[PDB]
Amino acid sequence: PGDQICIGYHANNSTEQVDTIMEKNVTVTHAQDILEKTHNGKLCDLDGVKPLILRDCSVAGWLLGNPMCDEFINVPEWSYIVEKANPANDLCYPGNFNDYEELKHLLSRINHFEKIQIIPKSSWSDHEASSGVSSACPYQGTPSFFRNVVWLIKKNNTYPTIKRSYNNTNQEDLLILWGIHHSNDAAEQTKLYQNPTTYISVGTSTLNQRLVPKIATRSKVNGQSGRMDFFWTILKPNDAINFESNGNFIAPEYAYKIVKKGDSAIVKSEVEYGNCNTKCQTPIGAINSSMPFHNIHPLTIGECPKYVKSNKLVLATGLRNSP
Amino acid sequence: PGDQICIGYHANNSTEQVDTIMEKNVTVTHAQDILEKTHNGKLCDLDGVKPLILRDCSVAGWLLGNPMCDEFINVPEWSYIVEKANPANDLCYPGNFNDYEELKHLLSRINHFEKIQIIPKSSWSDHEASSGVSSACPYQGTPSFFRNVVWLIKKNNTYPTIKRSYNNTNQEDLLILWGIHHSNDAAEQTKLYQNPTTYISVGTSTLNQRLVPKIATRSKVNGQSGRMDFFWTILKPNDAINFESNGNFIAPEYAYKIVKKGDSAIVKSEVEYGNCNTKCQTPIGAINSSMPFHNIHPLTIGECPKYVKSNKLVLATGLRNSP
Amino acid sequence: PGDQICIGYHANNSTEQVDTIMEKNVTVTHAQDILEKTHNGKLCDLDGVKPLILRDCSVAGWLLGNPMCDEFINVPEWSYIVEKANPANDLCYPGNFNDYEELKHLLSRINHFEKIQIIPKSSWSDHEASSGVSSACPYQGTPSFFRNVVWLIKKNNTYPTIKRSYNNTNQEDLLILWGIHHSNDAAEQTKLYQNPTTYISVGTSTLNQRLVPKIATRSKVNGQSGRMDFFWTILKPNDAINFESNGNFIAPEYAYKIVKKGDSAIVKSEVEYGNCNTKCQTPIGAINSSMPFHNIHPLTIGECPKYVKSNKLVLATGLRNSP
Amino acid sequence: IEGGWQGMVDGWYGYHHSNEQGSGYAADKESTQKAIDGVTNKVNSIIDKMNTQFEAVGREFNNLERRIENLNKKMEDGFLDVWTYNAELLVLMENERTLDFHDSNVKNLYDKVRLQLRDNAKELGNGCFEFYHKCDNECMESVRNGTYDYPQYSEEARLKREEI
Amino acid sequence: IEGGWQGMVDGWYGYHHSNEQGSGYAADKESTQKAIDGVTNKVNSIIDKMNTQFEAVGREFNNLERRIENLNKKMEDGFLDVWTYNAELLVLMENERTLDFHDSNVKNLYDKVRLQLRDNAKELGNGCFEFYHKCDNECMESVRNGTYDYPQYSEEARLKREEI
Amino acid sequence: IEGGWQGMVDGWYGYHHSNEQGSGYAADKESTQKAIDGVTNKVNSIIDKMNTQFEAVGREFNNLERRIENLNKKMEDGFLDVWTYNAELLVLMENERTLDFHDSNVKNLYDKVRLQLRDNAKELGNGCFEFYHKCDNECMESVRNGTYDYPQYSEEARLKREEI
Ligand SMILES: *[C@@H]1O[C@H](CO)[C@@H](O)[C@H](O)[C@H]1NC(C)=O
Ligand SMILES: *[C@@H]1O[C@H](CO)[C@@H](O)[C@H](O)[C@H]1NC(C)=O
Ligand SMILES: *[C@@H]1O[C@H](CO)[C@@H](O)[C@H](O)[C@H]1NC(C)=O
Ligand SMILES: *[C@H]1O[C@H](CO)[C@@H](O)[C@H](O)[C@H]1NC(C)=O
Ligand SMILES: *[C@H]1O[C@H](CO)[C@@H](O)[C@H](O)[C@H]1NC(C)=O
Ligand SMILES: *[C@H]1O[C@H](CO)[C@@H](O)[C@H](O)[C@H]1NC(C)=O
């Protein structure tokens, strides 16, 4: 015959397929998957910093010191917070937690607290503090009540008018929480508090509230016809907070200093901790990868690939490879 | 000469033009318009299910039983709800409908109601129910008032204290609505209700309100200086609702059981019904098409092509075709 | 040798580089930058219309007539409004300005006001108007108070019940503002106002409020333990507004007619005016350009190129040009 | 290349011969098919990837909720702008690729032929080859299906070249 | 192909001849025009399709409206990310197409010539043809405007080929 | 063109010769390199331009904040749809360009060779040239690196053509 030279290209046994606007399922020689699809199924630290797992406790249960949340009496710094969808240990008296979701959102820029005694429980000389207890709020079977907050009642037949104030002497914003007890009828009102017409009055530089208890008949929630609403504010460094009341006041004992402020969120996971690390965490598991995309879960936290709802993102790098 | 072979391509008389990043108005042999531009100008069913046309009635007028909305006393299931921009038959007493838009939005996941008598009008033995009437609310010229709600007044010179409660015995959330009458002066107050200082008190497991009538002088709206505010809540399956009042209470008679919960919205159309069908409806007309895009109207409902604000989306499929 | 013809292309000394998905820093013969990067560093008119520079005054300080804001006693039409981040001349009594941000947002569709006397200061025959003054609100060192609003007090030992109303006789919506004074204790209350239990009652066709002063002890803000809340409403053409009070009322004198309604916003600039023009303005400077993109500042106002966060957008138009 | 064949109804690309036995059009089956397979899935891919939309809503706000309402309004204008922009640049870009896809495929037919008959024909520079030799219908069929025998007409082509 | 002509100031694409009468550059009028018409509307299409933006706003929130404020903030970052992303990938993609648009157009000039003078010239493999024959200025003008007569120089080309 | 070389492990594009001294594969160093440089930065550009994302959040609403909640939900579905759409059409479009990038580069190798040996070889129409002449290993190396001397084999090619 005669000598020959030929122009040709690479082939192999690769079976990785790849797509095109005009062609589907095109076998290629080399390719890159960019869509990440795997996760470790666990909740992990972020950047060597553990999260804050309230197990069966809610943010309110934790901050007000629900008796079953004692394990969180003095937590340390955290990367994020994980809560269940329906924590069994929330409030123990039925009622509203005012601007809850805004409080919750505030804990998303906060990283660590410092629980401070703000007005001691033993200062209430003229009121009966220790009877701040109810069956609606169990502890260890025994009737108990929030630990971070005092339910004052009359001493003798007398609820003298309370007038207390606190000057934040610190350089950090501090989070204070208090409450009001809506009694059921005139009789309960008198037996608990003496005075028939009452008010809680709380004031800062920014805040000016006056709460009046709504005395009415209700349907029993947890076998309890009464209600209890809670409230919160941030007290700036050199501002003072003033309380005044002659009844139904659920006074604070402990407040929370904010140190420090950083990144966080509040994950609604049921998944357990796993002693791992990641810069990217989702509710259903962490992901230690390096890719521009993933399809794990929408609600992601940290520095994470773009969540996308594709099943496949594969870039052809090599050549058409049919045998 | 000599024999010839030629390489060539299709041509025709087609005049469909098509665009390119470098060339505009390029005549092509075959093309596909993907932008849908036509609609049937009518309001139609969705998937064999008619919508709920309140004609000149509003959602409030309908739910509270405004006398001119009688045609909607017992409607059946619906796909969506159509309301005019300014319904002539809304409230008949001037006043606020609390969290209206949230109520409205709730009817967007609801598909069908069941109007239930919750506390009969003939139970009010000690109060004058039937005089719950006013000129501000006409019916057939005659002075009337909402049908689904009772405006109680004193019997003899006595408005005894009302204490009624309802335990939802059903397995469906039910929607209850009540109201308060702000009178004009001390005299009107006494003549209607007897007691000078009054309150409405409504309670569920989640709700705890106490409403006090604002007695003041006002500008006449519809020749009426008084006002009337309304309120609503959802009552969960085994929860009970408690009412207490000694005046100015606009009590419920009928509530609405929710069955069923699905997809819906509230269209602001003036267009009339047309006995048609579609899976895609807009305020200005239905569209029975099959295309990735349309430019009919932004506010679309159902499974509808992507609204876009282009006038032309045409894909060239065939060849450049110049003669 | 033999004669030759060659096929070739343009070259030059151009050094403009351009990018590609496969190649970076590719020198080209001609190119177009489309990303705009320069601004005049000044605040300018829009379309021959100057903006409204409140210098150290805030929107509230301006509308209520804070004594240090006198230069804005009767401003003319404006294109937009520029405010500092922390104006030194806001309220002069500490307190809340109800729905402030909604008011602010309303001035974003407004272009010009007309300050109208709505109920003259000399009409208050039975109350002491001129003592509506305090040290918390300085003027020229002297104790003063808002100019557009009267702080009424008792004449003799008598604050008779105020009952005044205003029928908007104009064809424009007008903006009315009033306030309430929360005193510190029963003593101050009596000395200022006589009556111990008081209320402000304001009503339109749409509005129905009743304000009760919260008498409590507070932390001194600007050496002042008292508080003062303000309120506002729009009064439609033929509607009337009714006021009633027997104490702590901060009555209006001047209202604002709205003419006209157009485009605007509220820029938070520190930059000074520059006697320039633009159709596009940013907080840090105007831009007179013509390009599809810019990277100057996110918060832009007018008809402005798409803000983008790229450093470079350059389109190759000519040819690859390497020597 | 001088324009399209008004006379070719059989397909998208093809041939036109003329010889002593007369003349005729003839579309390429494979080439026309490949173009339709390609172009149609292009259309579908554009259409099918749009699978995104399902739910639909307006939304309602009162007079003291103008910030939220405006926020809602700008979200809708926001996504509308983006989606309008995409669809329009998707079409322009892709319509261009479609058009020179066709040019590329036509060129491939021209080249398949040019390789089979190097000096057996003259490239007129017009899309057509003037055969040096006589090319009967079967010789023509042969150049269309690739099964064309060059050496048969070799010296015939050479000898009748040498007439020039 | 070996690079661009620093010396061609007349246009974007063109020719360079050298013969006994000397040498010179000469731009193609049609080709250069077609490229400018194409490239310029590409630029405008990118710019004009942007017709979307009209209104502009920031937005203001109090201390108990941090969820809404963050929602507002993320909407703006959201659309900014998308619009940044588009503009950058629009440029890269389109700049590439622009560059090999030019390569394709240059290749078309080279091919228009190559078809007119098959064996009358040697393809140097460099962008240039070494004519077999003598090609006076008018012969050169003729190859530029397509109006070149091959058969004139036929045997001249053949006979002076046969010197090799 | 008839398919890829299972036997070419040295690179992406290259050659296969066969002669009296035997046979062998040989990849093009420059061409394979250019393709990797191009294809890899394509990948990175897609990946790196994504630099946009930093912060992350869900968000929480009560029972009387269903309008806001739905607004929040639609913002997330909104951007998800857009970002899903982009990534998928980015891949399809770009994968196509990648594939005929390779076809174009292979064609360039074929053309570099075809220009060097016009009538010294037969274009088989298959990716291969049947040399007219005897082409020893050094003659083959010469056609690969561009440094191939045509005139050496000129009349040899002509004379052994003339055997046909
Ligand atoms: C071309 O002829 C071959 C045999 O030489 C045959 O197999 C093929 O079917 C023919 N093509 C057509 C289109 O008939
Ligand atoms: C080329 O010559 C033709 C006639 O052969 C003439 O019509 C044309 O104008 C010439 N081209 C130029 C650029 O002058
Ligand atoms: C090809 O040979 C040239 C000299 O003719 C030499 O410079 C070059 O290195 C050779 N190519 C290879 C791949 O060795
Ligand atoms: C405590 O806070 C008050 C605010 O009430 C501030 O004025 C004061 O500076 C602080 N105490 C002292 C002694 O300065
Ligand atoms: C009716 O509802 C109440 C809530 O008040 C619930 O506890 C009870 O189970 C229901 N009635 C009965 C008889 O169980
Ligand atoms: C003034 O406004 C009232 C609203 O109170 C309106 O009814 C009336 O028409 C106006 N005055 C007169 C004299 O009409």
Coil, helix or strand at residue B165 = strand
Whether residue C165 sits in one domain with residue C295: no
Supply C254's token pair.
């001047």
Coil, helix or strand at residue F88 = helix
d(CA F153, CA F142): 13
d(CA C292, CA E90): 13
What is the whole-number distance in angstroms between the Cα of residue F145 and the centre of ligand 3?
Answer: 6
Whether residue A28 sits in one domain with residue A118: no
Supply A144's token pair.
């108990």
For chain E, give every domain's residue range: 1-164
Total length of chain F:
164
Q: Where are the beta strands (DSSP E) in B183-295?
A: 200-203, 208-211, 227-235, 240-245, 249-252, 254-258, 266-267, 273-278, 280-282, 285-286, 293-294
Whether residue B147 sits in one domain with residue B210: yes
The CA-atom distances, in angstroms, between C52 and each of C97, C107, E20, E37 are 21, 11, 77, 47
Peptide bond into A260 cis (omega under 30): yes
Q: Is E41 on the interface with B (CB under 8 A)?
A: yes
* Look-up of token digits 């172009």: D39
Supply C135's token pair.
């040290």
Coil, helix or strand at residue B153 = strand
Number of structural domains (chain B) is 2
Q: Is F67 on the interface with E (CB under 8 A)?
A: no
d(CA E77, CA E70): 10
- Give the contacts of D142 (CB within 8 A, at least 6 positions apart): D148, D149
Range of the domain at A276: 1-49+272-323
Residue finishing a domain among A271, A290, A313: A271
Say which CATH number the domain at C91 has.
3.90.209.20
d(CA C149, CA C254): 7
Residue finishing a domain among B255, B271, B287: B271
Largest CA distance in chain B: 123
Task: Identify the residue among B208, B209, B239 best suited for mutation to test binding to A, counting A beta carbons within 10 A and taking the highest.
Answer: B208
Whether residue C133 sits in one domain with residue C10: no
Query: CA of B310: which chain E residue's CA is closest?
Result: E49
d(CA C170, CA B246): 42
Contact by Cβ (8 Å): C242, B216: yes
Strand partners, C113: C258
Classify burial at B58, counting beta carbons within 10 Å of its beta carbon; exposed 0-12, middle 13-18, buried 19 or more: buried
- Cα-to-chain-centroid distance, residue C113: 13
Whether residue A296 sits in one domain with residue A258: no
Whether residue A178 sits in one domain with residue A59: yes
User: Which 8-state DSSP code applies to residue A210?
Assistant: E
Contact by Cβ (8 Å): C252, C65: no
d(CA C143, CA C68): 12
Residue type, position E13, single letter? Y
Coil, helix or strand at residue A209 = strand
d(CA A47, CA A264): 12
A272-283: b or e for each residue (b if 16 or more CB lie within 10 Å)?
eeeeeebebbbb
Whether residue A64 sits in one domain with residue A23: no
What are the backbone angles phi and psi of residue F27, rounded to the nearest 5°? -85, 150
Task: Identify the residue among F74, F100, F119, F164 best suited for mutation to test binding to D, counting D beta carbons within 10 A and taking the highest.
Answer: F74
* Look-up of token digits 């005193």: C183
Supply D51's token pair.
């699978």
| Angle value at C-alpha E93, between E91 and E99, nearest 5 degrees | 95
Residue F34 distance to chain E (closest CA, Å):
15
d(CA D46, CA C187): 77
Residue E16 distance to chain C (closest CA, Å):
5
Inter-residue long-range contacts of F20-29, CB under 8 Å, 24+ positions, other chains counted: F20/A3, F20/F134, F20/F136, F21/F136, F21/F137, F26/F144, F28/F109, F28/F144
Q: Is F1 on the interface with D (CB under 8 A)?
A: no
Supply A31's token pair.
């390719």
CATH among 1.10.760.10, 3.90.20.10, 3.40.309.10, 3.90.550.10 for D1-164 = 3.90.20.10
Supply E159's token pair.
């006979």
What is the whole-number distance in angstroms between the Cα of residue A203 and the centre of ligand 4?
Answer: 15
d(CA B11, CA D7): 8
Contact by Cβ (8 Å): B251, B152: yes
Whether residue C62 sits in one domain with residue C172: yes
What is the whole-number distance in angstroms between the Cα of residue B109 and the centre of ligand 5?
Answer: 28
Task: Identify the residue among B180, B214, B227, B230 best suited for mutation to test binding to C, counting C beta carbons within 10 A and taking the highest.
Answer: B214
Whether residue C21 sits in one domain with residue C57: no
Classify burial at D67, counting beta carbons within 10 Å of its beta carbon; exposed 0-12, middle 13-18, buried 19 or more: buried
Supply F140's token pair.
């083959």
Helix (H) or strand (E) holding B134: strand B134-138
Strand partners, D45: none
Give yes or no for residue F145 CB within 6 A of ligand 3.
yes
Chains in touch with D (3+ beta-carbon pairs under 8 Å) read A, B, C, E, F
Experimental method: X-ray
Whether residue C320 sits in one domain with residue C282: yes
Q: Is E132 on the interface with C (CB under 8 A)?
A: yes
| Angle value at C-alpha B301, between B299 and B303, nearest 5 degrees | 125
The verdict on a CB contact (< 8 Å) between A309 and F102 is no
Whether residue C130 sits in one domain with residue C204: yes
Total length of chain E:
164
Whether residue B94 sits in one domain with residue B177: yes
A16-51: b or e for each residue (b if 16 or more CB lie within 10 Å)?
bebbbbbbeebbbbbbbebbbeebbebbbbbeeebb
Coil, helix or strand at residue C160 = coil
Radius of gyration of chain A (CA): 29
Give the ranges where chain C is alpha helix by DSSP (H).
59-63, 100-106, 186-193
Query: CA of B213: which chain C residue's CA is closest?
Result: C210
Choose among B21, B300, B309: nearest Cβ to D84: B309
Chain F CB contacts of C22 under 8 Å are 37-39, 41-42, 45, 101
The verdict on a CB contact (< 8 Å) between B242 and A219 is yes
